[PDB]
Amino acid sequence: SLQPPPQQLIVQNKTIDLPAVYQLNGGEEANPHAVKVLKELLSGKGMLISIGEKGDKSVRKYSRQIPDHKEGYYLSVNEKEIVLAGNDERGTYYALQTFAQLLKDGKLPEVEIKDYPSVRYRGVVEGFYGTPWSHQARLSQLKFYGKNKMNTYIYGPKDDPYHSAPNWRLPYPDKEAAQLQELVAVANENEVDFVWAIHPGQDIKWNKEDRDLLLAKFEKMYQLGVRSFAVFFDDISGEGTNPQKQAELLNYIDEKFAQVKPDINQLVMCPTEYNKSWSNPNGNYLTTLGDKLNPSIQIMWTGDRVISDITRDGISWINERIKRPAYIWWNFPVSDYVRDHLLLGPVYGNDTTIAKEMSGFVTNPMEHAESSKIAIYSVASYAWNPAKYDTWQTWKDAIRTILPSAAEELECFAMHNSDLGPNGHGYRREESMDIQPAAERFLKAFKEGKNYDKADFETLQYTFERMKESADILLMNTENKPLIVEITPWVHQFKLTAEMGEEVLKMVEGRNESYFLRKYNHVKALQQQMFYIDQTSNQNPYQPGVKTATRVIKPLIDRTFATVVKFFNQKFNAHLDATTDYMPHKMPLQVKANRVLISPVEIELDAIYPGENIQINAGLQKAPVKFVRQFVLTIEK
């Protein structure tokens, strides 16, 4: 079950045993990163094992089987010998990572593998807004990239003041600097290019002073061990957006720094026009870059829109203007504009035949580093072997990789936490696809008053039961504590969702008047609990709170609840309230942080608050306020 899937694989239906008696060959002269891993795998343990790079004495016999590609390797296992041979040092390390996935309980299959990546640079750009990844999280990421053959980590958290304006001019303080030094050492050991990016555009002056401060900063990062560099000009305005100046600065960094040090690897830039919708097809910006930028400098691209999947026509369009294959910055699973959602679905939508048209493929992920590993593991597989990329199987493999102790539970949670909900970027993902038809029918019948299928009722019922099992097991899981810490508030909200659905379904059955009323009041309590989570957890300034199962599950529950309530009201001349989200203030009102808003004559708050201002479309100077007669009211809470 190899991830990424190799270019070529020939399996023999025999198996062999990892030799306790073995002779090692090429150990001294192969990539030391690859040898270390081999030795960990052969721990406390005569069969021939030959390891080396094309050109080493050890692997002379196989030089014609080693693929002629950067990062390529040949791998083979039989009764007599094991071969691990890279076109180059990174290739040998990649052989070892493939070999590690073949070893299962001291047993190896008989296989012959020729393998190499279809895309040259593959990995992660930590390039989102929000809380930057923790130091420990980054340490974990770099190991994960090594294991999955991602060779690129671009460091560029938008809210790191030493990366963006104005402190991009200042060297990192000692503590952050020793942490970065450590990240580079760890990157180098897992064969990952640590790429340090800088984001100076918003207040850069095009003078010598700013140019030398930038080069002075790159020099300080070089002292920390950094060997690849990027300059980002995304999401800025003003003079920094000038294409001629941008190119001159980049060429100057190229000529006076990248092409002058002994050992610099990647030099990459991100344009102000970084996707088609944000480009001016009649303006000179992209063609200037394409014509003026030195040919070894990479140019990044997010596709047809800020958030978008990569199409053949889309990348043709950019490649023809920039005069080189774009280096893709893919904006998924980044959730910095839908901060109340987790995006845990599969990676899909990118053309799988366009490898030759791209220099690079990196994923911009969520501020939730462990949770992002599902998409990241999948991107590593897509970028290495797009031809064979399998969306759903890779998603499942990622999950079982990340949380083998509770894979089905995490699968359950992930598959109902995938869509983004409505947003201004217009990007959406599928969610809850398996149960969607059953949901769809149940709610057709029910609404129009025709009878639903029992098996559809039970499917819904089975799902809620499963959700509860997953939520509870994930909450207590101690295999990946950092992952659990990330998802926990979502897990609680997910459990509540499932209980609400069970209770709403008990209302549909509805023995008698007083059963129905017990169920109904329970539902109301559960709504209120969801509100309290949504108001107390993840209270960020942009999209505060906690949404889950939003595409299919919550709407089905809400709409079912509103419906039974209405039938009951008719049948009993009752006046039960049918509203679906709890709201403590009377008038659809909404609560966000200290705001109280009627969704874009009179409001009554659950209490007297000091008021702050009322924006329709006046300051309230702390006046006590309970009644009020865009429409956002801000209070002190």
From Swiss-Prot:
Residues at the active site? 235
Activity control mechanisms: Inhibited by 1,2-dideoxy-2'-methyl-alpha-D-glucopyranoso-[2,1-d]-delta 2'-thiazoline (NAG-thiazoline) and O-(2-acetamido-2-deoxy-D-glucopyranosylidene)amino-N-phenyl-carbamate (PUGNAc). Not inhibited by Streptozotocin.
Name a biological process GO annotation. protein deglycosylation
Q: Which PROSITE patterns match?
A: GH84 (PS52009)
Q: Name the domain of life this protein comes from.
A: Bacteria
Entries under InterPro entries matching the protein: BT_4395-like_hel, Glyco_hydro_b, Glycoside_hydrolase_SF, Glycosyl_Hydrolase_84, Hex-like_dom2, HEX_bac_N, O-GlcNAcase_BT_4395-like, O-GlcNAcase_cat
The protein's matches in Pfam families, at most eight in alphabetical order, are given as: CBM32 (PF18344), Glyco_hydro_20b (PF02838), Glyco_hydro_84_hel (PF21809), NAGidase (PF07555)
Give the result of residue 235 to A, as annotated: 99% decrease in activity for pNP-O-GlcNAc
EC no. given is: 3.2.1.169
Query: Could you tell me how activity relates to pH for this protein?
Result: Optimum pH is 6.0.
Q: What is the effect of changing residue 364 to A?
A: 95% decrease in activity for pNP-O-GlcNAc
Q: Where is this region: Catalytic domain?
A: 119-404
Q: What's this protein's function? A: Can hydrolyze the glycosidic link of O-GlcNAcylated proteins. Can use p-nitrophenyl-beta-GlcNAc and 4-methylumbelliferone-GlcNAc as substrates (in vitro).
Q: Which family does it belong to?
A: Belongs to the glycosyl hydrolase 84 family.
* Complex formation: Homodimer.
State the remark under miscellaneous. Metal-binding observed in X-ray crystal structures is artifactual.
Indicate what this protein is called per its UniProt record. O-GlcNAcase BT_4395
Lineage of the species this protein comes from: Bacteria, Pseudomonadati, Bacteroidota, Bacteroidia, Bacteroidales
